[PDB]
């Protein structure tokens, strides 16, 4: 390069699930992830963690808008809500007393946790697990998303003594974030999706060709069921106004998300909290949820990898090109997501604050499955 590899690869991570007793024993071999920014501070986020008290692995991509406070928040909190929602009763009790390790994060050095907000965050989680004390995975993911998005709403209202923290809850509730998350326990894949990010299964066909299977539907204006669902959630007189110019109330591209309290709160609460300023065409809120659509897939020996990615990838390529490219990469004919980012974008359309003229933030996780272990459950 004149230095192109240095950039593509600046953020590229990749994790191997450790061998036990000399053998690859998991249905997951490992994953690769990378990000390429188009925005100042990048607005996408990526996360990956292993449940320590329950078996599964969590992976996630989050596409922030109107700042990165909310993608940052959910990129670090959501997995704890999901994890704690999977804990059996007896285990919850343990923790309330004590302390037991919950998640092992697989993060690149550029990913980070919020130092200053840690106490507050633990407190809401704790509050949450206390109430759970007083197990369907699908129904866990759902309540976890909802509960996170709701706590985000409460924390914005409650504010904080610390002027900086008080500011943070607000910046978090007023910016928004998509969320597309995989949970894998053995042969059981669940994909919880909220927004226009996307999980895609790469299937190798018996002739060795590559096929793409969708595990999520983009929650936007192309999505019929979604436009139908928005209308049904409001009086008939709104059917014309709910979605316009392909946007939620003429504004938001993604039709589901965290934060974005502007599209959820009553006008009077937006006013009282105003201590941003503008509401939409806005009669019967809330208009927007963080509640995810959840898909289950039982893994097969054909099922070779899962690509989770924000729309910066997807707007660029056909689903089939993504799965083919990764398909060929993994199979001989480095990091799969660096590769996809390279095709997505010899050619130096990169430099400067004119990038988001030509591209979005791109964040990609490629999980690779262990066909022998998966096939061993067949
Ligand atoms: Mn974004
Ligand atoms: Mn995007």
From Swiss-Prot:
The keyword Metal-binding applies. It is found in: Mitochondrion. Mn(2+) 1 binds at residues 63-64. GO terms for biological process: dephosphorylation; signal transduction. Mn(2+) 2 binds at residues 63, 311, 360. Keywords: Acetylation, Calcium, Hydrolase, Magnesium, Metal-binding, Mitochondrion, Protein phosphatase, Transit peptide. GO terms for molecular function: [pyruvate dehydrogenase (acetyl-transferring)]-phosphatase activity; calcium ion binding; magnesium ion binding. It comes from the Eukaryota. Heterodimer of a catalytic (PDP1) and a regulatory (PDPR) subunit. Mitochondrial enzyme that catalyzes the dephosphorylation and concomitant reactivation of the alpha subunit of the E1 component of the pyruvate dehydrogenase complex (PDC), thereby stimulating the conversion of pyruvate into acetyl-CoA. Belongs to the PP2C family. This is [Pyruvate dehydrogenase [acetyl-transferring]]-phosphatase 1, mitochondrial. It comes from Bos taurus (Bovine).
């Amino acid at each position: 390069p004149p230095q192109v590899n240095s950039i593509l690869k600046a953020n590229e991570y990749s994790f191997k699930v450790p061998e036990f007793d000399g053998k690859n024993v998991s249905s997951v071999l490992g994953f690769d992830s990378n990000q390429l920014p188009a925005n100042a501070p990048i607005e996408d986020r990526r996360s990956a963690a292993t449940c320590l008290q329950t078996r599964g692995m969590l992976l996630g991509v989050f596409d922030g808008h109107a700042g990165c406070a909310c993608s940052q928040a959910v990129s670090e909190r959501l997995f704890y809500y999901i994890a704690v929602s999977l804990l059996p009763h007896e285990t919850l009790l343990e923790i309330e007393n004590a302390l037991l390790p919950i998640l092992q994060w697989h993060k690149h050095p550029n990913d980070y946790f919020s130092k200053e907000a840690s106490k507050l965050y633990f407190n809401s989680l704790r509050t949450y697990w206390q109430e759970l004390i007083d197990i369907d995975v699908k129904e866990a993911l759902i309540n976890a998303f909802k509960r996170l998005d709701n706590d985000i709403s409460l924390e914005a209202q409650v504010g904080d003594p610390n002027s900086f923290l008080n500011y943070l809850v607000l910046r978090v509730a007023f910016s928004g974030a998509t969320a597309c998350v995989a949970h894998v326990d053995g042969v059981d894949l669940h994909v919880a999706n909220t927004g226009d990010s996307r999980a895609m299964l790469g299937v190798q066909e018996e002739d060795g060709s590559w096929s793409a299977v969708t595990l999520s539907n983009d929650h936007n204006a192309q999505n019929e069921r979604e436009v139908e669902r928005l209308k049904l959630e409001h009086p008939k007189n709104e059917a014309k106004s709910v979605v316009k110019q392909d946007r939620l109330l003429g504004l938001l591209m993604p039709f589901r998300a965290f934060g974005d309290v502007k599209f959820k709160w009553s006008i009077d609460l937006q006013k009282r909290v105003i201590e941003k300023f503008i509401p939409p065409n806005y009669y019967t809120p809330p208009y927007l949820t963080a509640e995810p659509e959840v898909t289950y897939h039982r893994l097969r020996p054909q099922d070779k990898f899962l690509v989770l990615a924000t729309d910066g990838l997807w707007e660029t390529m056909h689903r089939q090109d993504v799965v083919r490219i990764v398909g060929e990469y993994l199979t001989g004919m480095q990091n799969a997501a660096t590769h996809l980012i390279r095709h997505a974008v010899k050619m130096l359309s990169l430099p400067e604050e004119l990038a988001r003229m030509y591209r979005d933030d791109i964040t990609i996780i490629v999980v690779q499955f262990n066909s022998h272990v998966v096939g061993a459950y067949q």
